[PDB]
């Protein structure tokens, strides 16, 4: 399993290489245990080989409400969320217990290791003993949504509350809701890929199209993400997408983060220049030249709370010019580089910049530019529309700008 | 998976007991999944010898077997329960358990469960925590014994699940009523019920003491219930507690096929008890009746002749059986062990003691030998110096004269000058076997 | 093994540069018996970059592959020698070993050999020391050269005793005359023989200089002998020192099937170089010839159209090949790579560039692309904004403009003013492929 | 290593011989794995029982023990030389191998080398081929003997490389001069050189007849050289071939630490030889000198009292050593084995036989006991009934009478009337050690 020095060659797995060299709570919408046991199983098995310890929470599918509403015991939603009855425990018990063991077997029959924990975790307060027991043997802990009081009586508990408590106690890296409808929908009703809570939670709540169902579905996901490190994330895909949505570039599911406060200012004195200076020296090979910060004339500075990512804009013959874009390695891990770049370009639809031709960020610049002139040491990029005449001239000035860092 | 199996194979086949062990393993393969062995172990063992316990169990499972383990936690919940200021009431049963005690009982038995699972994995084994989900019980006692339960059904689902994954199933004695209510099961009935649902080949009680003791304070090697059980209950020497364990083991064995057995040892001895004929600890079987007679005509001589031929290698000399006189014959019902006496100048003389390896290991050789010496308090016999059985005879003898080829033993406390002449006679006897 | 394969294939089971690695891992399970790879390593690369060398070498193991490694003396044989006596040199190179200079060679090659074998093991791999017993040599006029030998036979017994063991044969250039007399053999003479006997699919040279530089001074990523050799020998900026290595390399590759290749890079990049189409370092192959013509009557339009359809997921629209007015067409003689150029308002215009991945992997796309841009120092062209070749195109462009669907590129000394219009005509040209 | 070392031990713990094997492992758990054993295999064995040889070696290797194996393809080479011809010359004391015979001594040895390496791998073991590089040698008598060498230096680099990786180093007796001249090494001078260099714990000689023989034709189970060597060397029955082996084995052992030992055995019995204190082989130690004396004042009684306290669990009753009247005393230099004889109504009566467990396993209990019974052909003694040394006592007696607390044994030609008498007396004797 020494699969870590083998991938220090490729593309995006270097960020899985700096967490594989440094786990995942899954809520399963029960409407999918009956559905695709084998595929949901293939997912959790794969999840382990890439060093995530699945801790799965499952309820009943419609298969349980229908077994109930056919025994003449309609549970209904109890005008709360769920789980109301007395005559129902035997059925709930056995419908959950069979489903639980079904999964433990499937995961194994898809290569992964597992552990049936039908009972003894949730109270009515978490006992993680059986969980850690499984984690300690590299086992997926499949947990049924069956709970008990202190004295031992069986009570049915709410998956949402069990998930919360479990996420609080474990501090998982990743939280995953597997649903049949894999992703939140935007305004058009398309698949809303990325939510940055603390840089778009305020808009989202006020937003008209955000019905009360998502309105508090998100207020909850926030409570989860708030109770975790910033490195954590809540994915929302579905079984047959899990792989692509956990670290890689595709994931046709939603990816909520907590994100951090963003500084956008035009006042150089409001910025910690030494923190920025360390950010640049750490992000690039070498440090800023002597007097660089002293001489700097800020147009806009975009700097995330933790000073691990920043874009400093200046003015070049009136054209917005990007003077500095610096992201620490383990903050590109949490999307900060992107949050900063995005906010910056929202500000500057027309933008000029340059990069040393052998800089590794160039692919990204090329991806992002609307035009580019290449030369032996330097490439100038732009976005926004403009005339051959204009750009020619501003591109000439950009190439003539004196270096802002020393060394190779 | 590849390194383990393979290297245990071309392993032990170079070890001392390796042959004997492969042979027990290969046979024990009446797998039916979790039909190998139910092992009871008290909490006092999980508390006083956890490394040892775990190792012994880990060994079984790395050698092919899949023990289902059931554990108590007496010392554990005596401590944890006094610490939480809750008194115990041993009313007409073994202890009432009121609502206030449950949380403690649940957590203490769950802790101990996990400890034992974890320890097994640390020993290199594979083990599943199953503190709940197997015993469904009725709560028949509510006012009288609180929350104690009688196992009404055994759900083996989790046991079967673990076994398939090749894990030892570690079960605690917590049950669930039919409505989901948590319940305390006493370890005796819990074991009875599991043993009845699994019908295992082997039941094993792991104790710190490691065996039942005879009248002399020695470990009683084996018990043949078909012959020894009456005697053992109507015996003044057998303490009240051992009487109970005896009647309980009887109860268990009665509800199993004839091929099953109970063993009683300590963890450190578990392997030698399971995989040697020798054993170590007490072995208990339902067993077979045994015939004592003075009449040769009521004996199956071709059946015996086969026993004698297989026990020693070479056969009986021609005319041996139609000429044999016969003072007394003691023959186990299956003809796999027999003692035949004749008379030597007036003395009782053991002319044949023949036991097949498997019967030796079941303890029928012992059984035949004991009923024989009860008959013949004074006894003469001989044996080749090569006979590996000589160690046993020496333990059993009251005297011995060794020679290059033969060794005369005698039993019964007469003196050297009194047997001197019958010893000379026994030496001069003709071989009763060819080769 | 069961904890190695399917996890490395399951990572590649659906990703990026993993459609092509899983492709290389499959080809590479072809004749594992050690016709896989001879890997020559400079004497120096085992002082400077020993841990990186090891880990590179070990990765190949964890992935199935069993390279035969040959190592030199270099900085070792120099220092350790002169610390006693004055060395000399008579033959073209082949140092010289008087006779009493041998004992040092043996122990020093052995040291380095074991040092390498240990370092690989420490890094997680499997290596066998084969400091001797593979090269059988002849003495070359003793009185002038001493104890330096020419390979007469190659014994592969100890090399297959690793191939069978899954370890990586680490070979020292030590030999023995037909009468056991230890002898010194020369590095790449020894490689020549090893390659001749094993006929590797791959022959890799490791150096601190991660490859071969070109006119500008970049790592020249590939050499197609059929079309590049003369060009490179008759070359100016190819210093005589580079010419030794091409002669040698051509030599080795002529003694190999057309599917083989040489690879000269740095240990850190060896994997990129072996398991990706783009590699990382200098790849050399015997290759294959190509046509450069401006007559459209001389091309197989049927063949080009099947390659375009195989290169992109779609075929040219009806009547394209009909009305195509070639300026220049550059076609590799297998037709697995091609560049076709038309004339756009007086500009040279790259109209089609098509390479099957196979040909991409083996440097034929580069060959075709280079002659083309040498013919057209000033080119215009476009590509779909989401085409992976855009990476290559950017590395090769002097300027670009990107809209949502198309991207226009150019080479040459033009600024945005001189090309503004033709770029605009290029964005407006019609598709030449189906949906 | 620590990862596999744990599991292998857990298994072995619950084996009958788990203890001793566990103990070899811990001994060699670190960075001297090649100092476990040098194993010499006779030419025959590779010819006849290759498959068993291989399985033996592969057993040791599977438990974590890396032998350093040396072979000299004897018989199969003899024939190979009868093949190409020119085979005879045995001038001095060794064979003489001329320039003509070399190219094929090589190929034969180098060949068996691979077969053995490959058998071990097949049998589930791990093994490195080391046919050349280790033995450096000065060429002996250029003329009279030819291309033969006396080892001058031992290069252990390759061996350590093998050990370090957990492979058994398989070494052929091919030498080479400092001027790189391949040469033929004598197999026994080869082992001596290697043993000197590695300072192994075990030196094993695998043979097909596996085990040395005594006068009566029985396997000679152990030799304690400090006390046995001289006798063995002057005994009529000890022949010339065997005398030669003892001479050589004594040299090996005089140059190793005290804890080292030589085993001579059959491949099929290797495990039982190293890991039990049984086995069909002969065990040989440098051993321990031993007094036999009638002189109580020449003995360290304090030490004997401590021997007695460890052997049995209690010290002698007050006044025992003061009162003692020694008939004859056999005490081993280290006081870990002792037999003390007294006089019982004139009969020789063994009053003490005390042997610590380690001494027993070294064969010192046998050294003392055998010397003692040589001196007292007629002997009476007693022993508590629950004494585990009783099985051995029975194996040694000519008769025995058993009672509840005690059992009286005797050896010697003795009439019923006699025995009865002295036996009655021995049962009556008072206990010599304070009670349990
Ligand atoms: C900017 C220039 C390169 C031309 O392009 P353009 O017409 O301005 O179009 P743009 O590139 O500005 O707009 C598209 C771009 O922004 C983005 N974009 C537009 N809508 C988007 C959306 N809904 N979601 C995500 N990205 C979007 C794209 O990602 C794209 O660039 P990309 O291909 O690198 O991904 C220009 O420098 C040029 O030379 N034009 C000259 C003007 C003229 O009229 N010339 C005629 C002769 S004088």
Author numbering:
A (entry chain Y): 10 to 31, 40 to 141, 157 to 440
B (entry chain X), C (entry chain B): 5 to 439
D (entry chain A): 5 to 440
Which statements did the authors publish about this structure?
We have now succeeded in solving the structures of two NAGS/K enzymes, from Maricaulus maris (mmNAGS/K) and X. campestris (xcNAGS/K) that have substantially higher sequence similarity to vertebrate NAGS. In both crystals and solution, ngNAGS is consistently hexameric, while mmNAGS/K and xcNAGS/K, as determined herein, are tetrameric.
Several MAD data sets collected from Se-Met substituted wild-type protein were not of sufficient quality to locate the selenium positions. To increase phasing power, three additional amino acids codons were mutated to methionine (I106M, I294M and L367M). Crystals from this mutant protein diffracted to 2.7 Å and phase information was obtained from the MAD dataset. The asymmetric unit was found to consist of four subunits assembled as a tetramer, and unit cell parameters are consistent with four subunits per asymmetric units and 50% solvent content. Although both native and mutant mmNAGS/K were incubated with 25 mM CoA before crystallization, only one bound CoA molecule per tetramer, with incomplete occupancy, was identified in the cleft between the NAT domains of subunits B and Y in the mutant structure. The equivalent site in the Se-Met substituted mutant structure has residual electron density that can be modeled as malonate which was present at a high concentration in the crystallization buffer. Relative to subunit Y, the NAT domains of subunits B, X, and A are rotated 25.2°, 24.7°, and 16.9° toward the AAK domains, respectively. The clefts between the AAK and NAT domains of subunits B and X are in a closed conformation, creating a steric clash between bound CoA and the arginine binding loop (residues 281–287).
